[PDB]
Automatic annotation (TrEMBL), chain C:
Presumably involved in the processing and regular turnover of intracellular proteins. Catalyzes the removal of unsubstituted N-terminal amino acids from various peptides. This is Probable cytosol aminopeptidase. Belongs to the peptidase M17 family. Mn(2+) 1 binds at K89, D94, D106. Mn(2+) 2 binds at D94. The chain holds residues 169 to 336 of 504 of the full protein. It comes from the Bacteria.
């Protein structure tokens, strides 16, 4: 038997006298606990708001609120997806409730010294949708764990080792490049940025090959970013690599008819007697040059050569994900990512995917007039203009390295990848796993078309 | 006879040997001067780039480059709009060339102590288009003059006087509110913000009533902003009011079948023994309250009551224009404005209008999750969260004051209203008149539908 | 005369413009050696133990944080009755060290001295001129010069 049962209630739905006396008015995520009818167990009444305004995000948030209110129970049954009357179809309700339950239960206690809850059950006939939601949420929590991991544990070599182990679990193809084998690939930005650190850099390629469409995902894996010699105005700057790895791990379970390759440059950015210097010039894999005008804009320099490699003459589409710029957050706020692409059809695909996933993105323009801020007196471009517009300038910088004719999108997720404000809804303090579920929904949509 | 004739040349078009020897390759805006065939005058060869890639902006920029290269000539004939072969229709070429000529000739020398050019002629059969372009550019230059004017000359009372004089020129209806007559309107934000200054505030309503659609335009007219007691991290913070006034002055010439009302709060924000204090609460015209948490976010507080008045139970649509937030510029850069509206159809109308005008805007989202950053411990809202996302938060703040059911758009033009980098194309250093031409094109489109 | 003076100026411009990753102290010493060879200016490059022997304590202390080792170069034009010594600061990259700045152009003095010396054989001045060129990077590092450290100089002062 369930120790606790969570009942979804839209505004106007009947609850008992005790629930009314406690102030239950079905506000989204409001929870009031009471004894079960027979007095042997617990019932949670959980608000879903007005039936007419409810979305999948309402259900996701209500499930997370339910799991947070479980107390010392061993078993919890969520009946939330059985609540009908909203416009959210049964399968969408089931998927969202399953996701919210896993996301809301997430804890990162690995590094504390010194959970009665053994089973969460989602009630619904939509078993496929439950499975899909659990898998998406489990992938999100993998990314959360990677971001939360101290940089001393998750070094570039350790991260490469972890990716290899994850790949083995579905027999994703995995190649790890290190030392002389890495030098051979000509990823000059990665090796230049990574050299100051005592930890050597790594490059990992991770392939799902279950198709007619091949998608390349590029994820920024800076495991610790101190700003280098220039300083910042630090373990979470591998959030892009975390999102890409996690999305790839979810694909074998979903069984999408789509080939997907992950490209993952891993490094630390540290000050040191041998660190990358202001004024240095990097000669990239495509023969073009970048002048290092600020060592804290290292991400774009690392990604450059990987985008050349990923788009070389073959992937039909390349998507990069990176915690790239701080300028983004000033106008967009802390919970919204930035999307760049020249392809309007790809923009709509990514944006609709983010809406299904409950993740907030804003498309920003690849402004031609900001290219003047890439100009260098010495090299082909700079990595920092010291002027306003760095979020757009970084996107334009990356665009230079994507081979002619290859559709491309760039996701700048610096702010929403790490929550330094309190927990809310299904999102914890700290590493969030932001963009995992957007990526999965994007890949699902691309596989259909 | 013309002392100078400017000839438009697309890439591949024939020029003489001298022009080739000087390096003329028809780059957009490249100018090479040479003797006329008879040796009595001057010819400018002016680049228009590849015929296939040329836009109206190409023509606007080429015309501005031509006028800058005139030397001591008394008369200039631009033949640029006669260049065909691009996809830009003849009327669009003529309008753009006329605009670029006026915009490129602009100078603000009123305050220097101690122009042989008497006539600029645009050659084309499209005389209506030339007239339209000259009028749009003349309105833009009016806004440039107002922004460039020292704050000691353009005080709130002086600005109100200037608007009255401008209105008289077409018999636009004009009402100026001051002193006790101003107090009666209940524009509490304007009177609170304006009180520290020795200059009293003004409120001006300016109406074009030549229609079935009535549009309200609200323009922020802070003639000098010191930041108040809180300080800034200053004469150009009336760029929104300048744009609105200038757009209104252009309507009688164009003769649009559309009623348009301008609403213009004018004030200085100064530190003083009687200045607005951090912690003060403003009770607005709609009965709601705002807590002043930072005196440098005064614009939104001034606009609040005017939006109540402008949308009160009647205008079919309200558009506000304001140099509102500095956060905008960090990710968008210095040459792009921010557009906010909940109405997708209105967004497309404004964006297409800006494209016709050659002005850069980016639509940003009214993010529901940023409303939590409007919360106050004392009042209904704050004017500053001290958190990231202020550009979005300011838009949400303003949205609160627009009456239910009234379509609304907000243009945040803080960065592109004043060019503190060098002149380029048709844009000078200093006051730019940004958004005048977007507003005119928006009103044209609305009048058709 | 004008072409030669301007060509020397442009040599200095090239050295200053060169990225610090290319123009390291060892690379700069190599370039000076090659320039000297072109007129047979006498050139001595001091490195490692040979450098330590000269007792240029300030140079070795400042230069130690960097992965790049310091160099000291003496470059002599000896075509005279007057002998002039030119000393040029050759910090090829200055990060500020551990204290930080409030960076490749801090070898402009060494560049000017080297370039002036290269112009003398063409002009044929009846004057002996010696260049003295300490070359190093100033970097933060676990082994970098510390605030509070004391340098004992070649003259015994601190
Ligand atoms: Cl970067
Ligand atoms: Cl404001």
């Amino acid at each position: 038997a369930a120790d606790v049962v969570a009942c979804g209630r839209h505004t106007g739905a009947a609850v008992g006298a005790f629930s009314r006396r406690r102030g239950f008015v079905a506000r989204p995520g409001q929870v009031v606990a009471e004894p079960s009818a027979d007095g042997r167990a617990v019932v949670l009444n959980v608000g879903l708001g007005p039936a007419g305004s409810a979305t999948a995000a309402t259900f996701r948030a209500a499930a997370a609120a339910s799991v947070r209110a479980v107390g010392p129970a061993r078993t919890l049954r969520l009946d939330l997806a059985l609540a009908d009357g909203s416009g959210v179809p049964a399968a969408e309700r089931a998927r969202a409730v399953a996701e919210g339950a896993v996301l809301g239960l997430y804890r990162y206690d690995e590094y504390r010294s010194a959970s009665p809850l053994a089973e969460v059950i989602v009630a619904t006939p939509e078993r496929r949708a439950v499975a899909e939601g659990l898998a998406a949420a489990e992938a999100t929590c993998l990314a959360r764990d990677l971001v939360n991991c101290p940089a001393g544990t998750l070094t570039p070599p350790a991260f490469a080792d972890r990716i290899r182990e994850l790949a083995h679990t579905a027999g994703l193809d995995c190649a790890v490049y290190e030392g002389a084998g890495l030098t051979e690939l000509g990823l000059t930005g990665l090796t230049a940025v990574g050299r100051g650190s005592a930890e050597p850099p790594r490059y990992v390629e991770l392939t799902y090959d279950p198709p007619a469409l091949t998608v390349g995902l590029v994820g920024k894996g800076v495991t610790f970013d101190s700003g280098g010699l220039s300083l910042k105005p630090m373990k979470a700057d591998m959030g892009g690599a975390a999102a890409v790895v996690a999305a790839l791990t979810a694909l074998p379970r979903l069984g999408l008819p789509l080939r997907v390759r992950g490209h993952l440059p891993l490094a630390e950015n540290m000050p040191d007697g041998g660190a990358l210097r202001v004024g240095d010039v990097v000669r990239h894999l495509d023969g073009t040059t970048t002048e290092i005008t600020h060592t804290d804009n290292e991400g774009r320099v690392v990604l450059a050569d990987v985008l050349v490699r990923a788009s070389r003459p073959r992937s039909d589409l390349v998507v990069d994900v990176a915690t790239l710029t701080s300028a983004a957050v000033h106008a967009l706020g802390t919970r919204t990512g930035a999307l760049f692409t020249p392809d309007d059809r790809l923009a709509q695909t990514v944006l609709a995917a983010s809406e299904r996933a409950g993740e907030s993105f804003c498309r920003l323009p690849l402004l031609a007039h900001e290219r003047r801020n890439l100009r260098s007196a010495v090299a082909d471009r700079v990595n920092c203009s010291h002027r306003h517009g760095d979020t757009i300038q970084a996107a334009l910088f990356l665009q230079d390295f994507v081979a002619a004719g290859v559709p491309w999108a760039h996701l700048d997720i610096a702010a929403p990848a790490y929550n330094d404000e309190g927990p809310y809804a299904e999102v914890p303090y700290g590493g969030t796993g932001f963009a995992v579920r957007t990526l999965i929904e994007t890949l699902r949509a691309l596989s259909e078309g």
